Design a protein around this ligand. Structure first.
Ligand SMILES: O=C(O)[C@@H](O)[C@H](O)[C@H](O)CO
Ligand SMILES: O=C(O)[C@@H](O)[C@H](O)[C@H](O)CO
Ligand SMILES: [Mg+2]
Ligand SMILES: [Mg+2]
Lengths: 399, 397
C-alpha cells in the first residue's frame, strides 16, 4: 500500500422514492473512488453546503489511508461540533474512505473489520395501517417472504385538531391524542397475538409520543405481549426516566435513532437502560464511530439495531449490513423494500432473502451511485408537516 | 398578533470573523435583529435560515416566542448541534427584540428587570513573555478592570521546536507539558508581582488529557484563579468528580455545549462553578433563561461565552441576560474594532470594568444593512483547529 491522495469530493442529493438521500463521493489520484452516506433527509441542502464549502477544501490533497486521523481531524475542524449537519457530512466522507480502503485491499468492507461473526443479519420490516385488516394484509405478505420480525402500528397519528378535544382556535399543526394512541396500540398488540400467536416477533415504535408517566404505564401494560422491542419510548432528553421502567418492567427497549452526541448514549448504555442501541450511523459520524459504539455496547451487554428506515441510501444500508455481519452483538437490520427508482440510482442494492440480509461480497462497500441517473430525481423541498406535532391544548410535543 | 412578513440572514465580515445576523420583518413595521453566529461554518447557517426556517416562520405570530422556539427546535426531527441551533438563535433573539420594541422596553426589562446595576467584565492578556503580560495587565488595571484572563505563551504552528517525529503530519502543534509548566509559572509570577490586586482567569481550552487536568487542577489551586476554563473536553466531564473530590479550584465550562445532555448531569452534580455556554449555540435567549434558572437552583453562576466572532447584537443580548439573571457573574470582554462598530451601531464598551445594559427599547443594537454589504462573507480555513500533539495525534482544539 502507498499513500492514497484525495483528488476531489462531490455531494449528491437525490430523491428516487419519498426521501431526499445524500451521497458523498471521494475521488483519488489513484483512480479508486469511494462512496458514502450523508443522509439527513430533512435538511439536505445544509449537509451539501457543509461538504462542498467546508469539508472539501480541508480534504483535497490528504492521504485517504489514515481514516482514523481524518475522522478525528474532521470532527473538531469547526471547533463547535457534534450535530446532525456536521456529523452527516463527515459520515459521507468517512464511509467513502472506508470504501476506498476496502477497494485497495480487494476485500468486502466487513472483511477489513475482522470478518464475519454471523452468516447474515435478520431483518424486520414495517406494517402500518389505519385498519387491523390493513396490518394483517401487510403482515401476511411479509410472512410469505420469510420475515420473522415485523414492526406493527395501528392508526396514523397527526391530522386536523377537529377530531380531538381541542380549543376554540387551534394553532396550525399535526394533532394527536396520547391516550387514543396508547389504547389503539395495546388493542393492536392483543389482536396480533390472538391472531398469530408467536409466528413473528412484534416490534413497535412509540416515536417519543409520550410523557414520562405515560411511558411507564405503557411499558407495564405492553409487557404481557412480549414485544421484540419497544422503540423510543422516551425522547432523548428524558432517558433518565428509564430507570423507573427498568425497575418494574421486563419490556425490551430500543432507543437512539435521534442521537448525534456521545453524551446522549454514554450513561444510557453504562447503566443498561436499553437493550438495543438504535443510532443512525451517519448521525454519529460514520463507520469509524459506529465500530467504537458497537464495542462499547458489547461491553455492557447491549445489542445493536441501527436505524435503517427509507431515509438513507442503499450505500448506507450496505454499510450497515457489513457492520451487522461483523459486530458480534448486532441483532437485527430494519428494512423497507426499495422501489424501482432507487434500485436504478443505486445498482446492486441487496434485498432480504427469507428474512435475512447478506453482506456484499465484492471489493468495497458493494454499492455505488449512478450520478447521471441520480440527476433525474433532484432534491425536493418538503415541509415535513408531521414534525409540527401538537397535543389537543395546542402545545408542541417531540415528534 | 405580530405577523412575520419576511426573514433575512446576513453574513458580514467587518473584522476577522464571518458574523451572522438574522432579521425578522413584520407587518407592524417593527423589525427584529438576532445573532446566529457560527463563524467557522457561516454558509451552512445561512442555508439553514434561508431554505428551512423561513418557510416555517412566514405568516406566524411573532408574539408567541416560546411556541415558535419549541416548534423550531424539533422541526427537522433530528436536532441540537451548532448549525440548527445558531439558525434558531438568530430568529429567537430577533423575536425577543420585536417583543421588547413593542413593549417600548430594554430587553432585560421584559425578563423582570435588573438584579444588579451592571455586570463586571474580564479582559484578555496573552503574551509570549511575562513582561508582555505585565504591560497588558497594567493597561487593563488602569482602565478599571479587576478580572483578567492571562496566558503565557502561544500554542500552535510548526513542531520544529518540539520533540516531534521524523516527518510530522501537517498541523498546528503544541506540547501539553510545556503548556502546563508555562501556565503554572505564569500564575506564580503574577501572584508574586500583583498579589490579590486582581482576579486571574485562565482558559485551558481542552488542551489536556484527564489525568493531566486532574494534576493541573491540584497544582494551580494555590494561585486561586477566579476560574479555570475548559479543563476538560465536553465528552470527559465525568472526570470532574475526580477533581471536585480533592481540589478547591473554581471551574468554568461549556462554551462548546450544544446539547442539554452535555450540561444536565454536570450541573445537577455541582461539577462546575460557572456555566460558559455560548447563547446562540444553545438556541438563543429562550433556552438561556431556562439554563440560567437551572444553574441558579444548583448554586452555579453564569459566565456566558463572548468573543469577537459574535455580533455586537449577541453581546448586547448577553449584557441584558447578565443584568437580569441573579446568578450571572461576569461578562467576557470583546474589544470590537471600528468597522464592526460601523456595521452594528451603538455597541456598548466597558466603563471602569463594568458593562451596562442598553436602555433603549429592544436589544439596543441592530445591523446597518448597507454597511454590512461592504464586507461580504470570505472563506477562512481556521487552521488552528487542526491541533496536534508532538507524536502527530489530533487533540481537541
Ligand atoms: O424507526 C423509524 O423508521 C421511524 O422512527 C422514522 O425514522 C421516523 O419517522 C423518521 O423518518
Ligand atoms: O473563551 C474564549 O474566548 C476562547 O476559548 C474562544 O472561544 C476560542 O479560542 C475560539 O475562538
Ligand atoms: Mg423509529
Ligand atoms: Mg474558552
Amino acid at each position: 500500500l502507498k499513500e492514497t491522495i484525495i483528488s476531489d469530493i462531490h455531494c449528491i442529493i437525490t430523491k428516487p422514492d419519498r426521501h431526499n438521500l445524500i451521497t458523498v463521493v471521494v475521488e483519488t489520484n489513484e483512480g479508486v473512488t469511494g462512496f458514502g452516506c450523508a443522509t439527513f433527509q430533512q435538511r439536505p441542502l445544509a449537509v451539501k453546503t457543509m461538504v462542498d464549502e467546508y469539508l472539501k477544501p480541508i480534504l483535497i490533497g490528504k492521504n485517504a489511508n489514515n481514516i482514523e486521523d481524518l475522522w478525528q481531524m474532521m470532527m473538531v475542524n469547526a471547533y463547535w461540533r457534534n450535530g446532525p449537519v456536521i456529523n452527516n457530512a463527515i459520515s459521507g466522507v468517512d464511509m467513502a474512505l472506508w470504501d476506498i480502503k476496502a477497494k485497495l485491499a480487494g476485500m468486502p468492507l466487513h472483511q477489513l473489520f475482522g470478518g464475519k461473526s454471523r452468516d447474515a443479519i435478520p431483518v424486520y420490516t414495517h406494517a402500518t395501517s389505519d385498519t387491523m385488516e390493513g396490518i394483517y394484509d401487510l403482515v401476511e405478505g411479509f410472512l410469505e417472504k420469510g420475515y420473522k420480525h415485523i414492526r406493527c402500528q395501528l392508526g396514523f397519528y397527526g391530522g386536523v385538531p377537529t377530531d380531538l378535544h381541542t380549543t376554540q382556535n387551534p394553532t396550525e399543526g399535526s394533532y394527536y391524542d396520547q391516550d387514543q394512541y396508547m389504547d389503539n396500540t395495546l388493542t393492536m398488540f392483543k389482536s396480533l397475538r390472538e391472531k398469530y400467536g408467536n409466528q413473528f416477533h412484534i416490534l413497535h415504535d412509540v416515536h417519543e409520543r409520550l410523557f414520562p408517566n405515560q411511558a411507564i404505564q405503557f411499558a407495564k401494560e405492553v409487557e404481557q405481549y412480549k414485544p421484540y422491542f419497544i422503540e423510543d419510548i422516551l425522547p432523548p432528553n428524558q432517558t433518565e426516566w428509564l430507570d423507573n421502567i427498568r425497575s418494574q418492567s421486563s419490556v425490551s427497549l430500543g432507543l437512539g435513532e435521534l442521537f448525534n452526541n456521545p453524551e446522549e448514549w454514554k450513561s444510557l448504555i453504562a447503566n443498561r437502560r436499553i437493550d438495543f442501541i438504535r443510532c443512525h450511523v451517519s448521525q454519529i459520524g460514520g463507520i469509524t464511530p459506529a465500530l467504537k459504539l458497537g464495542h462499547l455496547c458489547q461491553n455492557f451487554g447491549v445489542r445493536i439495531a441501527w436505524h435503517c428506515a427509507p431515509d438513507m441510501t442503499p450505500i448506507g444500508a450496505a454499510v450497515n449490513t457489513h457492520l451487522n455481519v461483523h459486530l458480534h452483538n448486532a441483532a437485527i437490520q430494519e428494512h423497507v423494500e426499495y422501489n424501482g427508482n432507487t434500485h436504478k440510482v443505486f445498482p446492486n442494492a441487496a434485498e432480504p432473502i427469507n428474512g435475512y440480509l447478506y453482506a456484499s461480497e465484492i471489493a468495497g462497500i458493494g454499492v455505488e451511485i449512478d450520478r447521471e441517473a441520480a440527476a433525474e430525481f433532484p432534491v425536493m423541498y418538503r415541509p415535513h408537516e408531521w414534525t409540527q406535532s401538537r397535543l389537543p391544548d395546542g402545545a408542541i410535543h417531540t415528534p
